[PDB]
């Protein structure tokens, strides 16, 4: 799709069987959702935004369904004020900024 | 012009008479700068993100030109680690996400 900027770029996505709003999120190198539980190994990661550091457990190479467009890839879970999905996921679905 | 998101999409902005580099950001619902002293009338305001709240600035009505592009609006000055160009002016340089 194209999708303009006069509200928020919200999307659906689909993780572990679940779906789930998320954010299309240009500024964001990660992605990162709220605390939920995702199968398989993690790593404890720390990752810093515009107020400072928070501790994310870094799960690998999860596929994610995003606005029916299919990623695999590396999802940070942790206290994000929302679902974020940053450039990593972004450039796999295709999503590029036109003006 | 179309940026990819491979790396991070920054931009050369003006405002005031300074040329900066900021990201062009879906996920930034104002546009957040660096701090800089501009002349005017503001009010204060706390916005979040990751790792919590920052304090800022907020100007109205203020000029920037983003890659050519003519815009005016509100713009947010604080202790940000990047310039953000937020949907408010993204909107107003006709950019869209198409994947
Ligand atoms: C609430 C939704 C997100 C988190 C909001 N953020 C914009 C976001 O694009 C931010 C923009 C940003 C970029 C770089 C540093 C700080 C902020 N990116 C960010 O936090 O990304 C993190 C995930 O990937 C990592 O890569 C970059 C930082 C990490 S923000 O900067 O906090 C932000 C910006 C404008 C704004 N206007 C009103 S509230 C508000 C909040």
Excluded: S
């Excluded at 770029?9 to 939920?36: F, S």
């Excluded at 029916?68 to 590029?96: D, E, F, Y």
């Amino acid at each position: 799709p194209q999708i303009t900027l006069w509200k928020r770029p919200l999307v659906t996505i689909r993780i572990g069987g679940q779906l789930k709003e998320a954010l299309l999120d240009t500024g964001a190198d990660d992605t990162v959702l709220e605390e939920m539980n995702l199968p398989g190994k993690w790593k404890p990661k720390m990752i810093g935004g515009i107020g400072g550091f928070i501790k994310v457990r870094q799960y690998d190479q999860i596929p994610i369904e995003i606005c029916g467009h299919k990623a695999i890839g590396t999802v940070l879970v942790g206290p994000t004020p929302v679902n974020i999905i940053g450039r990593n996921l972004l450039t796999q679905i295709g999503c590029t900024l036109n003006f």
